DNA sequence: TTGATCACTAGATGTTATTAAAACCTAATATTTAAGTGATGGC
DNA sequence: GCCATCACTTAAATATTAGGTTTTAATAACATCTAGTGATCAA
């Protein structure tokens, strides 16, 4: 018996109003499926979300605990698991997904399988275990017949795209989606709809069409009740705000910490975009991580240090920087803050060369900013935005 | 009997020494598969380079109706219609290749099948009747056995992003071919290096690398004997110096003009590339096409009159262009004339928006160089060009 | 009578098992190639 | 002579075929779902 079947019978011994208005949260008519559920092993509901929102609803601080141990408890080959290898992607439950994965690779249940070598595909291509082109030969290969897996073939791609800077190819791809051509899984056709709104909110966030940005992550925020994509919503949202409203963006990622402060990653990362902003603005900073070595952390450690005259401090820090392996990103900072502390417009040229190389349309605001006030040619300028 | 047979057959009437000179300009020892291939109907060259390499040195000016009628009368279950499929690709002879295809993916030979698939997916892409995701999900789902298809696979995708300005993933795609695993055909494999040099030749001169641009075309240039590849590596050559260096720009362009005057394709190519030079350096101009109303003709008639401050016929010029419907890249060159005209910078500046608008990284030199000449700092224009 | 619990139901959705027909190896068998050799035969 | 022509030839590189898997597609047979119904049992 699965750990969220023994809670919801101990709250009804406690209280026998429960079970209608489970229901009406499951959006079932009735509560007979309810009753199915706790009294009969291996009965699934037709929708995911029927299970998903109660457990969001009476057992929202152990969603974890509880949907793992109900999700692989799952019989593999139906669709109740199908939808739990997208609710494990969605909220970044790998463990559970990758688990998922490798016995629905197995199965003998066609749909199950396919799914499940899909979602392999995404995760060996998100892990860069193997390059676009053999992925999306594999997918050719796999002979796809679901519309959902159709949906999410261009979906992973799409991430893929985005983790690596290529965004030419994104408005073109992204349009090809067509999530009314789903009949069999609301639950994946309704996450996939939140996945579009906020790689739409990105796609507009890397055109520097801003508006356009926040109103792609307000519709994602309205369409889910899923904590990973509010938190990249405020996120995206945040950023967007980044260089123009120190407060709107505070607000933005305060709003995030708040909703994620009890998991450590998503803490981490609302910590580290608190740290951009107030070292963006010059502010004294509270949400220095000293204790990482990561290239990201000490970089604002750097910044910090520059924008309060502390150069030494600033030199130890870059001299310990000088000491790692950087992609062309990274490089791209390390010489706004070379630039910054050496007071040497050169290295801003080679910051905006490497956020050119590394395809950034936003970071490089940070040199762009500079020799703005070292007194260059604004439209010029504005024109290396584009 | 091929009219390449009947003609060498007579050639031999007239003149006796024939059979060991074309024996050693098809790279054989001795003359005995000529005197086969001369005697019995199906007998092919183990190298199709051997008589590509007697039709170019004999019969230079009938190279088409000769390879024509030569490649439609093979067997295409033989590595002989493979070979003659990439050279009909290769030499833009597409209603041979498009015939070769259509035969090859219905007969019973599997590798001339694969060969016929994979250049129909080829000639799919590249004419826009597939995405670039259908072309390579195809791909997958063909189980590509042969190394050549394996690096063509490859080189076809490579041609697609060319085409459609997305170079970011060309540098990661051409680094996974690899040539030296090709066994079978070295025709195949000697023209697949020549389309790699030409390819790494337009990734250079994308990322503003002019002189690995020319290197990679000049190791082109001296490793064919096919028209289209020294054509547009003459051209490339010459584009790549054409806002730098006026003599060595002209020079890359005689040749090409010289090679390609008298055929159709190609005649224009080069009038155009030496009335765009003409114009940049403020020359005499004998290349303006007067005869065309096209958008870009009429433009260099403007450039050409307001270079010799003919400012009537420029004005007159420029009302007929008013009248027309430009997209964003005539827009970007309609700024730049108003720029130069009038005298004033914002034009300069808007020009320069529109050619980022329509992701040209040539043009866009044009008025770069204006406000280079006006003492704008150089630094950064050099940087616009990224 | 309320109301909670639960096993029935029907009809729509989902899942599995059965085929037959395509497609894919692969290894034997057979064919075709380049480049020596030696026969004509016209000078 | 001695040189062009060209059938043999060898062994190496290519092409074909026939077979037995495996893969794929379609659908008939089976099962599970939601949301009504009506039984108990408890106030």
Redesign the interface.
């Known amino acids: 018996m699965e750990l969220i079947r023994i809670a919801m019978k101990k709250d009804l011994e406690n209280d026998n109003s429960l079970m209608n208005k489970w229901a009406t949260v499951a959006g079932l008519k009735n509560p007979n499926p309810l009753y199915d559920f706790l009294n009969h092993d291996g009965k699934t509901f037709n929708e995911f979300s029927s299970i998903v929102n109660i457990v969001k609803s009476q057992y929202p601080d152990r969603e974890y605990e509880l949907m793992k141990d109900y999700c692989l408890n799952l019989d593999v080959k139906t669709k109740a698991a199908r939808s739990a290898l997208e609710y494990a992607d969605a909220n970044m439950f790998f463990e559970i997904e990758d688990v998922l994965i490798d016995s629905m690779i197995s199965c003998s249940n066609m749909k199950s399988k396919e799914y499940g070598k899909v979602y392999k595909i995404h995760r060996e291509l998100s892990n860069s275990v193997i390059?676009?082109?053999e992925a999306?030969?594999?997918?050719?290969?796999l002979?796809i017949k679901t519309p959902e897996m159709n949906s999410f073939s261009?979906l992973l791609?799409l991430y893929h795209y985005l983790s690596?800077?290529?965004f030419?190819?994104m408005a073109?791809?992204i349009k090809?989606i067509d999530l009314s051509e789903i009949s069999e899984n609301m639950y994946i056709r309704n996450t996939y709809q939140t996945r579009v709104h906020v790689l739409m909110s990105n796609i507009k966030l890397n055109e520097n069409s801003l508006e356009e940005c926040r109103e792609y992550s307000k519709k994602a925020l309205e369409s889910t009740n899923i904590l990973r994509f509010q938190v990249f919503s405020y996120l995206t949202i945040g950023n967007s705000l980044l260089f123009s409203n120190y407060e709107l963006a505070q607000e933005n990622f305060l709003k995030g910490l708040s909703i994620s402060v009890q998991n450590e990653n998503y803490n981490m990362i609302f910590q580290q975009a608190l740290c951009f902003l107030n070292n963006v603005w010059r502010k004294e900073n509270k949400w220095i991580n000293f204790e990482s070595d990561s290239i990201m952390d000490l970089q604002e450690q750097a910044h910090c240090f520059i924008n309060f005259n502390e150069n030494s401090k600033a030199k130890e820090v870059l001299d310990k920087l000088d000491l790692l392996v950087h992609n062309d990103n990274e490089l791209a900072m390390h010489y706004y803050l070379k630039g910054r502390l050496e007071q040497n417009?050169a290295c801003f040229?080679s910051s905006?060369?490497y956020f050119?190389?590394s395809?950034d349309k936003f970071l490089i605001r940070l040199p762009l900013l500079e020799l703005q006030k070292m007194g260059?040619?604004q439209?010029?300028?504005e024109?290396?935005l584009?």
């Open positions: 390059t676009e082109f999306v030969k594999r997918l050719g290969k002979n261009r791609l690596t800077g290529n030419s190819p073109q791809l090809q417009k040229y905006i060369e050119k190389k395809n260059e040619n439209k010029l300028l024109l290396l584009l």
